[PDB]
């Protein structure tokens, strides 16, 4: 009911040599860089607001606790972006990034489009370390702006720290993205029409991602394909700790789960990216 690493490796080679595989990277892809995930940000937001980190986490979801932080005082969200910039894109986080085996194995492949939901320059920065060049596309002016003819376009689906208006962190920013009208939303839905995705380091907890794959399956069911042909194009979801309910919800949406070895989380991902090559 769940693919292993050796079973999913020839399925990822076929989609990559056709140029129809696109990585979708999450917050967990920057964990060997000693960066906070969605839980240690809330531990840092509770320290500023005067909460205890265990008591503050019981007052709502991740989207709702950041909305409470941004309206506690004026210019409180701007300060967070400044602090995050100092800690996510620091010089010691760049030094851990050349010697990271995942970021070397990601940049060794010749991708054309990479989607990320992280606030750091460590995905396109891994491409600059391997001699390649990337193109960060986060806002409307980036898509309209000039780029080289053949460059891996890194689509910042959540925003970038150098453009603080594009960051979706609070609940009102996620509700603004429910209309699927943003330029990262329009680019994702057109690439999902024709390409397989590889989810690495991302867990389907945001309802803005789960709603896009819902309405792609709707176009699939109304097109009245057979049992054989509607199950042909799959997506892949590499996760060390997938439960029992969530892999069966995603079988509806043509998303296969790749079970990685949870003992060393960094080396299990690196062996997946080297098996595509």
């Amino acid at each position: 009911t769940t693919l292993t690493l050796s079973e999913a490796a020839p399925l990822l080679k076929k989609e990559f040599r056709e140029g129809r595989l696109i990585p979708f990277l999450g917050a967990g892809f920057s964990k060997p860089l000693k960066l906070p995930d969605g839980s240690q940000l809330i531990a840092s937001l509770a320290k500023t607001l005067g909460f205890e980190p265990e008591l503050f986490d019981m007052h709502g979801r991740f989207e709702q606790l950041a909305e409470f932080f941004a309206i506690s005082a004026p210019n409180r969200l701007q300060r967070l972006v400044y602090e995050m910039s100092l800690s996510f894109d620091s010089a010691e986080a760049e030094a851990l990034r050349e010697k990271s085996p995942m970021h070397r194995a990601l940049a060794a492949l010749d991708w054309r489009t990479i989607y990320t939901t992280a606030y750091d320059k460590h995905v396109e920065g891994a491409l600059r370390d391997a001699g390649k060049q990337a193109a960060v596309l986060a806002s409307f002016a980036d898509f309209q702006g000039p780029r080289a003819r053949d460059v891996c376009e890194v689509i910042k689906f959540a925003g970038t720290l150098d453009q603080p208006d594009t960051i979706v962190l609070t609940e009102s920013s996620y509700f603004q993205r429910m209309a699927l009208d943003a330029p990262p939303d329009q680019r994702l839905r057109a690439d999902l029409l024709a390409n397989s995705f590889l989810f690495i380091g991302y867990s389907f907890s945001d309802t803005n991602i789960r709603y896009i794959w819902y309405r792609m399956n709707q176009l699939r069911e109304q097109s009245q394909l057979g049992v054989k042909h509607s199950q042909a194009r799959r997506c892949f979801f590499a996760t060390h700790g997938a439960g029992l309910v969530q892999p069966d919800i995603l079988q509806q949406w043509n998303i296969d789960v790749i079970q990685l070895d949870p003992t060393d989380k960094s080396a299990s991902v690196a062996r997946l990216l080297e098996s595509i090559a």
Partner: protein, 180 residues
């Protein structure tokens, strides 16, 4: 309407705290059952008990937990006194050697308003009785004699027991810090 809620399932703790803090109109009463963690330190157990009771009732809550550290047992039970009195009822006077009967009766309140937990600890020196004497009170009161006094907590009335017990010094601190 109340603003602070004292959570206990023990109906003997409830009529003690209503004997002194009963006249305060700002204090309500709830009876949610929580599960304590396994540790002998009173500060650790009462602090993890308040977050487990705020999670149950979702209002500003006050919880209470005790300790009966004994010198002959190197501080045991500590905050593990609830399953000792269940197991060793009055044999607890006999498992301890005669001659080194000294002990401490500790008690802690912790109030959690939802964003911070504050612990108030009082403490009463005493000694374990040679045998269980006394009828009043409740759990382990027939075995504990405070320092200077000759009688147990069970042999004293509710006004006399609260002039020795840790709760009698915790009423005034809880009323002052919460404005009850």
């Amino acid at each position: 309407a109340p603003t602070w809620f004292y959570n206990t399932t023990n109906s003997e703790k409830l009529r003690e705290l209503q004997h002194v803090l009963g006249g305060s109109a700002k204090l309500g009463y709830l009876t949610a059952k929580v599960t304590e963690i396994l540790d002998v330190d009173l500060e650790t157990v009462i602090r993890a008990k308040a977050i487990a009771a705020y999670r149950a009732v979702r209002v500003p809550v006050i919880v209470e937990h005790g300790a009966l550290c004994i010198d002959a047992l190197n501080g045991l039970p500590g905050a593990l006194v609830k399953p000792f009195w269940e197991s060793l009822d009055t044999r607890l006077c006999e498992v301890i050697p005669a001659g080194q009967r000294t002990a401490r009766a500790r008690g802690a309140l912790c109030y959690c308003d939802g964003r911070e937990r504050h612990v108030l600890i009082e403490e009463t020196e005493g000694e374990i009785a040679p045998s269980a004497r006394g009828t009043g009170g409740f759990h382990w009161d027939p075995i504990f004699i405070p320092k200077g006094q000759t009688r147990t907590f069970a042999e004293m009335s509710l006004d006399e027991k609260l002039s020795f017990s840790p709760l009698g010094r915790l009423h005034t601190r809880l009323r002052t810090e919460l404005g009850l």
